[PDB]
Amino acid sequence: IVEGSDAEIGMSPWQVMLFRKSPQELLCGASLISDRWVLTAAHCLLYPPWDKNFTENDLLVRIGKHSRTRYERNIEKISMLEKIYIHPRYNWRENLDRDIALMKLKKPVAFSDYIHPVCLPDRETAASLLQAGYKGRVTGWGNLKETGQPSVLQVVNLPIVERPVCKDSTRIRITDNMFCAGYKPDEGKRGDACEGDSGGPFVMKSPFNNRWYQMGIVSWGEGCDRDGKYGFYTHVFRLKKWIQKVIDQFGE
Amino acid sequence: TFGSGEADCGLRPLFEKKSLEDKTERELLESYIDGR
Amino acid sequence: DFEEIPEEYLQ
Ligand SMILES: NC(=[NH2+])c1ccc2nc(C(O)(O)c3nc4ccc(C(N)=[NH2+])cc4[nH]3)[nH]c2c1
Ligand code: NA
Numbered sequence: 001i002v003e004g005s006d007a008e009i010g011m012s013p014w015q016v017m018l019f020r021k022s023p024q025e026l027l028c029g030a031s032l033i034s035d036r037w038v039l040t041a042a043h044c045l046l047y048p049p050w051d052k053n054f055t056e057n058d059l060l061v062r063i064g065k066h067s068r069t070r071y072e073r074n075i076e077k078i079s080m081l082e083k084i085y086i087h088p089r090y091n092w093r094e095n096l097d098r099d100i101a102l103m104k105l106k107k108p109v110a111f112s113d114y115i116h117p118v119c120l121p122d123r124e125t126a127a128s129l130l131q132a133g134y135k136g137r138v139t140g141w142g143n144l145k146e147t148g149q150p151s152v153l154q155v156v157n158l159p160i161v162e163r164p165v166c167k168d169s170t171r172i173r174i175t176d177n178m179f180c181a182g183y184k185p186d187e188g189k190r191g192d193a194c195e196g197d198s199g200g201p202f203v204m205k206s207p208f209n210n211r212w213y214q215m216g217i218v219s220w221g222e223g224c225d226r227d228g229k230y231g232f233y234t235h236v237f238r239l240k241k242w243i244q245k246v247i248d249q250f251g252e
Numbered sequence: 253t254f255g256s257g258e259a260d261c262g263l264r265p266l267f268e269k270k271s272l273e274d275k276t277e278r279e280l281l282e283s284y285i286d287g288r
Numbered sequence: 289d290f291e292e293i294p295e296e297y298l299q
Protein backbone atom coordinates (compact mmCIF):
# COMPACT_ATOMS: atom_id res chain seq x y z
CA ILE A 1 0.00 0.00 0.00
CA VAL A 2 1.45 3.40 -0.88
CA GLU A 3 0.69 6.46 1.24
CA GLY A 4 -1.33 4.40 3.70
CA SER A 5 -0.69 4.08 7.47
CA ASP A 6 -0.20 1.08 9.74
CA ALA A 7 -3.39 -0.67 10.70
CA GLU A 8 -4.57 -0.98 14.31
CA ILE A 9 -4.72 -4.36 15.96
CA GLY A 10 -7.95 -6.19 14.98
CA MET A 11 -8.87 -3.49 12.40
CA SER A 12 -9.20 -5.90 9.49
CA PRO A 13 -9.84 -9.23 11.23
CA TRP A 14 -10.74 -10.75 7.88
CA GLN A 15 -7.39 -9.93 6.20
CA VAL A 16 -5.68 -13.20 5.25
CA MET A 17 -2.15 -13.84 3.92
CA LEU A 18 -1.41 -16.42 1.22
CA PHE A 19 2.09 -17.66 2.05
CA ARG A 20 4.32 -19.79 -0.10
CA LYS A 21 5.84 -22.77 1.61
CA SER A 22 9.16 -22.87 -0.28
CA PRO A 23 10.57 -20.28 -0.47
CA GLN A 24 8.65 -18.91 2.48
CA GLU A 25 7.34 -15.66 1.00
CA LEU A 26 4.19 -13.49 1.03
CA LEU A 27 2.27 -14.19 -2.15
CA CYS A 28 -0.91 -12.14 -1.88
CA GLY A 29 -3.65 -10.81 0.35
CA ALA A 30 -7.07 -12.58 0.66
CA SER A 31 -10.12 -12.28 2.96
CA LEU A 32 -12.01 -14.70 5.22
CA ILE A 33 -15.71 -14.86 4.18
CA SER A 34 -16.87 -17.84 6.40
CA ASP A 35 -14.84 -20.23 8.62
CA ARG A 36 -13.75 -22.47 5.72
CA TRP A 37 -13.65 -20.07 2.74
CA VAL A 38 -11.11 -17.52 1.71
CA LEU A 39 -11.68 -15.22 -1.28
CA THR A 40 -8.70 -13.86 -3.26
CA ALA A 41 -7.76 -12.75 -6.78
CA ALA A 42 -7.29 -15.52 -9.39
CA HIS A 43 -4.09 -14.16 -10.79
CA CYS A 44 -2.43 -14.58 -7.46
CA LEU A 45 -2.74 -18.26 -8.29
CA LEU A 46 -2.81 -18.66 -12.04
CA TYR A 47 -1.00 -16.34 -14.49
CA PRO A 48 0.53 -18.27 -17.45
CA PRO A 49 2.40 -15.22 -18.79
CA TRP A 50 4.76 -15.64 -15.80
CA ASP A 51 4.46 -19.37 -15.33
CA LYS A 52 2.40 -18.95 -12.14
CA ASN A 53 0.05 -21.87 -11.42
CA PHE A 54 -0.21 -22.62 -7.72
CA THR A 55 -1.85 -25.62 -6.28
CA GLU A 56 -3.26 -26.49 -2.86
CA ASN A 57 0.04 -27.92 -1.70
CA ASP A 58 2.04 -24.86 -2.52
CA LEU A 59 0.20 -22.42 -0.26
CA LEU A 60 -0.58 -21.79 3.28
CA VAL A 61 -3.07 -19.33 4.61
CA ARG A 62 -2.24 -17.21 7.65
CA ILE A 63 -5.08 -15.43 9.48
CA GLY A 64 -4.91 -13.14 12.54
CA LYS A 65 -1.78 -11.25 11.51
CA HIS A 66 -0.60 -7.74 11.95
CA SER A 67 3.18 -8.14 11.54
CA ARG A 68 4.32 -9.30 8.12
CA THR A 69 7.37 -11.36 8.96
CA ARG A 70 6.77 -12.80 12.35
CA TYR A 71 4.94 -15.91 13.28
CA GLU A 72 2.64 -14.25 15.88
CA ARG A 73 2.40 -17.24 18.21
CA ASN A 74 -1.02 -17.72 19.85
CA ILE A 75 -2.46 -14.89 17.69
CA GLU A 76 -2.42 -16.20 14.13
CA LYS A 77 -3.70 -19.51 12.77
CA ILE A 78 -2.16 -21.17 9.75
CA SER A 79 -4.47 -23.36 7.60
CA MET A 80 -3.95 -25.58 4.60
CA LEU A 81 -6.13 -25.69 1.53
CA GLU A 82 -8.44 -28.46 0.57
CA LYS A 83 -9.46 -26.98 -2.84
CA ILE A 84 -8.86 -23.85 -4.99
CA TYR A 85 -11.56 -22.88 -7.47
CA ILE A 86 -10.87 -20.19 -10.11
CA HIS A 87 -13.78 -18.56 -11.94
CA PRO A 88 -14.19 -20.54 -15.22
CA ARG A 89 -14.16 -17.36 -17.32
CA TYR A 90 -11.24 -15.58 -15.66
CA ASN A 91 -9.49 -13.76 -18.45
CA TRP A 92 -5.74 -13.65 -17.92
CA ARG A 93 -5.07 -13.38 -21.63
CA GLU A 94 -6.47 -9.92 -22.12
CA ASN A 95 -7.63 -7.83 -19.07
CA LEU A 96 -7.96 -9.99 -15.83
CA ASP A 97 -11.71 -10.04 -16.26
CA ARG A 98 -13.29 -12.05 -13.45
CA ASP A 99 -10.14 -12.05 -11.41
CA ILE A 100 -11.67 -13.99 -8.46
CA ALA A 101 -10.94 -17.32 -6.77
CA LEU A 102 -12.13 -19.30 -3.74
CA MET A 103 -10.07 -21.57 -1.52
CA LYS A 104 -11.66 -24.07 0.86
CA LEU A 105 -9.57 -24.62 4.05
CA LYS A 106 -8.83 -28.08 5.28
CA LYS A 107 -10.59 -27.42 8.65
CA PRO A 108 -12.78 -24.47 9.77
CA VAL A 109 -10.93 -21.74 11.64
CA ALA A 110 -12.16 -20.38 14.99
CA PHE A 111 -12.83 -16.67 15.31
CA SER A 112 -11.20 -14.53 17.93
CA ASP A 113 -10.68 -10.85 18.39
CA TYR A 114 -8.17 -11.11 15.54
CA ILE A 115 -9.95 -13.44 13.14
CA HIS A 116 -13.53 -12.64 11.93
CA PRO A 117 -15.11 -12.88 8.42
CA VAL A 118 -16.31 -9.98 6.35
CA CYS A 119 -19.77 -9.72 4.79
CA LEU A 120 -20.39 -10.12 1.03
CA PRO A 121 -22.70 -7.42 -0.21
CA ASP A 122 -26.26 -7.93 -1.48
CA ARG A 123 -27.82 -6.10 -4.40
CA GLU A 124 -29.04 -3.29 -2.17
CA THR A 125 -25.76 -2.72 -0.36
CA ALA A 126 -23.80 -2.88 -3.61
CA ALA A 127 -26.19 -0.41 -5.21
CA SER A 128 -26.13 2.13 -2.40
CA LEU A 129 -22.46 2.10 -1.59
CA LEU A 130 -20.73 1.73 -4.97
CA GLN A 131 -21.11 5.33 -5.96
CA ALA A 132 -18.34 7.62 -7.11
CA GLY A 133 -16.95 9.69 -4.34
CA TYR A 134 -17.62 7.08 -1.66
CA LYS A 135 -14.59 5.74 0.00
CA GLY A 136 -13.55 2.19 0.63
CA ARG A 137 -10.47 0.83 2.42
CA VAL A 138 -7.77 -1.52 1.23
CA THR A 139 -5.22 -3.33 3.37
CA GLY A 140 -2.14 -5.49 2.82
CA TRP A 141 1.56 -6.19 3.41
CA GLY A 142 2.57 -5.15 -0.11
CA ASN A 143 5.16 -2.67 -1.29
CA LEU A 144 5.21 0.83 0.01
CA LYS A 145 6.55 2.33 -3.16
CA GLU A 146 6.60 1.19 -6.75
CA THR A 147 10.40 0.94 -6.45
CA GLY A 148 10.15 -0.56 0.94
CA GLN A 149 8.02 -3.34 2.56
CA PRO A 150 6.16 -2.61 5.85
CA SER A 151 6.47 -4.47 9.11
CA VAL A 152 2.82 -4.14 9.92
CA LEU A 153 -0.39 -4.36 7.85
CA GLN A 154 -1.14 -1.04 6.11
CA VAL A 155 -4.40 0.63 5.33
CA VAL A 156 -5.50 3.34 2.90
CA ASN A 157 -9.00 4.67 2.15
CA LEU A 158 -9.65 5.63 -1.45
CA PRO A 159 -12.60 7.21 -3.26
CA ILE A 160 -14.38 5.17 -5.94
CA VAL A 161 -14.02 6.72 -9.36
CA GLU A 162 -16.58 7.34 -12.11
CA ARG A 163 -16.28 4.67 -14.79
CA PRO A 164 -15.60 7.07 -17.75
CA VAL A 165 -12.57 8.36 -15.85
CA CYS A 166 -11.42 4.86 -15.10
CA LYS A 167 -11.65 4.09 -18.77
CA ASP A 168 -9.91 7.23 -19.97
CA SER A 169 -6.86 6.39 -17.87
CA THR A 170 -5.87 3.13 -19.57
CA ARG A 171 -5.64 1.32 -22.88
CA ILE A 172 -7.02 -1.81 -21.26
CA ARG A 173 -10.66 -2.58 -21.94
CA ILE A 174 -12.70 -2.20 -18.72
CA THR A 175 -15.66 -4.64 -18.25
CA ASP A 176 -18.57 -4.29 -15.85
CA ASN A 177 -16.80 -6.72 -13.48
CA MET A 178 -14.31 -4.11 -12.34
CA PHE A 179 -14.46 -0.65 -10.82
CA CYS A 180 -11.42 1.61 -10.12
CA ALA A 181 -10.55 3.70 -7.09
CA GLY A 182 -8.12 6.41 -6.24
CA TYR A 183 -7.74 10.14 -5.97
CA LYS A 184 -7.55 12.41 -9.01
CA PRO A 185 -4.14 14.22 -9.46
CA ASP A 186 -6.27 17.21 -8.69
CA GLU A 187 -7.60 16.03 -5.28
CA GLY A 188 -4.40 16.52 -3.30
CA LYS A 189 -4.44 13.02 -1.70
CA ARG A 190 -2.70 9.82 -2.73
CA GLY A 191 -2.78 6.12 -2.02
CA ASP A 192 -2.96 2.83 -3.79
CA ALA A 193 -2.39 -0.83 -3.48
CA CYS A 194 0.86 -2.08 -4.93
CA GLU A 195 2.62 -5.35 -5.52
CA GLY A 196 1.93 -7.78 -2.64
CA ASP A 197 -1.57 -6.37 -1.90
CA SER A 198 -3.33 -8.22 -4.69
CA GLY A 199 -6.10 -10.59 -3.61
CA GLY A 200 -6.98 -8.42 -0.68
CA PRO A 201 -10.18 -6.64 0.11
CA PHE A 202 -11.62 -3.30 -0.67
CA VAL A 203 -14.36 -2.90 2.00
CA MET A 204 -16.95 -0.33 2.95
CA LYS A 205 -18.87 0.15 6.21
CA SER A 206 -22.60 0.19 5.72
CA PRO A 207 -24.04 3.31 7.37
CA PHE A 208 -27.28 1.29 7.67
CA ASN A 209 -26.30 -1.72 9.70
CA ASN A 210 -22.66 -0.81 10.74
CA ARG A 211 -21.23 -3.90 9.09
CA TRP A 212 -18.24 -4.10 6.82
CA TYR A 213 -18.80 -5.50 3.37
CA GLN A 214 -16.07 -6.45 0.96
CA MET A 215 -16.97 -4.66 -2.32
CA GLY A 216 -13.81 -5.37 -4.30
CA ILE A 217 -10.66 -7.50 -4.49
CA VAL A 218 -7.31 -5.84 -5.44
CA SER A 219 -6.90 -6.79 -9.13
CA TRP A 220 -4.46 -4.67 -11.13
CA GLY A 221 -2.98 -1.27 -11.71
CA GLU A 222 -0.31 0.37 -13.89
CA GLY A 223 2.40 0.91 -11.34
CA CYS A 224 1.59 2.03 -7.79
CA ASP A 225 0.17 5.52 -7.09
CA ARG A 226 1.00 7.14 -10.43
CA ASP A 227 -0.98 10.37 -10.99
CA GLY A 228 -3.77 10.03 -13.59
CA LYS A 229 -3.93 6.27 -12.97
CA TYR A 230 -6.02 4.13 -10.66
CA GLY A 231 -6.29 0.66 -9.17
CA PHE A 232 -8.84 -1.75 -10.51
CA TYR A 233 -10.77 -4.10 -8.31
CA THR A 234 -12.86 -7.17 -9.07
CA HIS A 235 -16.68 -6.27 -8.52
CA VAL A 236 -17.57 -8.90 -5.86
CA PHE A 237 -21.25 -8.36 -6.13
CA ARG A 238 -21.30 -8.86 -9.96
CA LEU A 239 -19.67 -12.22 -9.40
CA LYS A 240 -21.53 -13.24 -6.21
CA LYS A 241 -23.80 -15.79 -7.88
CA TRP A 242 -20.59 -17.61 -8.85
CA ILE A 243 -19.45 -17.49 -5.19
CA GLN A 244 -22.81 -18.78 -3.83
CA LYS A 245 -22.71 -21.53 -6.40
CA VAL A 246 -19.36 -23.00 -5.38
CA ILE A 247 -20.05 -22.63 -1.76
CA ASP A 248 -23.46 -24.39 -1.86
CA GLN A 249 -22.12 -26.98 -4.28
CA PHE A 250 -18.85 -27.75 -2.50
CA GLY A 251 -19.60 -26.89 1.22
CA GLU A 252 -19.88 -23.73 3.40
CA THR B 253 -20.35 -16.78 2.90
CA PHE B 254 -23.43 -15.59 0.96
CA GLY B 255 -25.75 -12.57 0.96
CA SER B 256 -24.97 -9.90 3.49
CA GLY B 257 -22.16 -12.23 4.54
CA GLU B 258 -22.42 -14.99 7.09
CA ALA B 259 -24.60 -13.80 10.07
CA ASP B 260 -21.81 -12.76 12.30
CA CYS B 261 -19.76 -11.02 9.67
CA GLY B 262 -18.53 -7.46 9.36
CA LEU B 263 -18.72 -6.65 13.12
CA ARG B 264 -15.18 -6.49 14.59
CA PRO B 265 -14.63 -7.84 18.11
CA LEU B 266 -12.58 -4.84 19.15
CA PHE B 267 -14.38 -2.15 17.54
CA GLU B 268 -18.14 -2.57 16.61
CA LYS B 269 -18.72 -5.29 19.18
CA LYS B 270 -17.41 -2.86 21.91
CA SER B 271 -18.79 0.23 20.26
CA LEU B 272 -15.24 1.50 19.59
CA GLU B 273 -14.27 3.13 16.28
CA ASP B 274 -10.86 2.91 14.53
CA LYS B 275 -9.21 6.29 13.75
CA THR B 276 -10.24 6.63 10.05
CA GLU B 277 -13.69 5.00 9.67
CA ARG B 278 -15.15 8.48 10.13
CA GLU B 279 -13.73 9.48 6.66
CA LEU B 280 -15.56 6.58 4.98
CA LEU B 281 -18.95 7.29 6.54
CA GLU B 282 -18.45 10.94 5.96
CA SER B 283 -18.00 10.26 2.20
CA TYR B 284 -21.44 8.65 1.83
CA ILE B 285 -22.60 12.26 2.18
CA ASP B 286 -22.38 11.69 6.01
CA GLY B 287 -23.81 8.89 8.17
CA ARG B 288 -26.00 9.11 11.35
CA ASP C 289 12.86 -11.95 6.09
CA PHE C 290 9.90 -14.01 7.28
CA GLU C 291 10.48 -15.88 10.51
CA GLU C 292 10.40 -19.68 10.64
CA ILE C 293 6.91 -21.05 11.35
CA PRO C 294 6.15 -24.35 13.16
CA GLU C 295 7.22 -27.35 11.02
CA GLU C 296 3.79 -28.97 11.53
CA TYR C 297 2.25 -26.49 8.98
CA LEU C 298 4.28 -27.81 6.07
CA GLN C 299 4.36 -31.60 6.59
N1 LIG D 1 5.18 -11.97 -6.88
C1 LIG D 1 3.89 -12.04 -6.68
N2 LIG D 1 3.34 -12.78 -5.74
C2 LIG D 1 3.06 -11.27 -7.49
C3 LIG D 1 1.68 -11.61 -7.61
C4 LIG D 1 0.81 -10.87 -8.39
C5 LIG D 1 1.34 -9.80 -9.04
N3 LIG D 1 0.70 -8.98 -9.79
C6 LIG D 1 1.56 -8.11 -10.17
C7 LIG D 1 1.12 -6.93 -11.00
O1 LIG D 1 2.35 -6.27 -11.30
O2 LIG D 1 0.45 -7.43 -12.15
C8 LIG D 1 0.18 -6.00 -10.15
N4 LIG D 1 -0.76 -6.35 -9.30
C9 LIG D 1 -1.28 -5.25 -8.83
C10 LIG D 1 -2.29 -5.04 -7.90
C11 LIG D 1 -2.60 -3.70 -7.61
C12 LIG D 1 -1.93 -2.62 -8.23
C13 LIG D 1 -2.22 -1.29 -7.99
N5 LIG D 1 -3.43 -0.92 -7.64
N6 LIG D 1 -1.25 -0.44 -8.14
C14 LIG D 1 -0.92 -2.92 -9.15
C15 LIG D 1 -0.64 -4.23 -9.41
N7 LIG D 1 0.25 -4.70 -10.23
N8 LIG D 1 2.74 -8.35 -9.70
C16 LIG D 1 2.63 -9.43 -8.97
C17 LIG D 1 3.53 -10.14 -8.20
NA1 NA E 1 -3.38 7.63 -9.31
Ligand SMILES: [Zn+2]
Pocket residue numbers: 043195196198199219220
Ligand atom coordinates in the same frame (compact mmCIF):
# COMPACT_ATOMS: atom_id res chain seq x y z
ZN1 LIG F 1 -1.32 -8.60 -8.59
Ligand SMILES: [Zn+2]
Pocket residue numbers: 194195221222223224
Ligand atom coordinates in the same frame (compact mmCIF):
# COMPACT_ATOMS: atom_id res chain seq x y z
ZN1 LIG G 1 2.57 -3.62 -10.34
Ligand SMILES: [Zn+2]
Pocket residue numbers: 111116260
Ligand atom coordinates in the same frame (compact mmCIF):
# COMPACT_ATOMS: atom_id res chain seq x y z
ZN1 LIG H 1 -18.33 -12.85 16.61
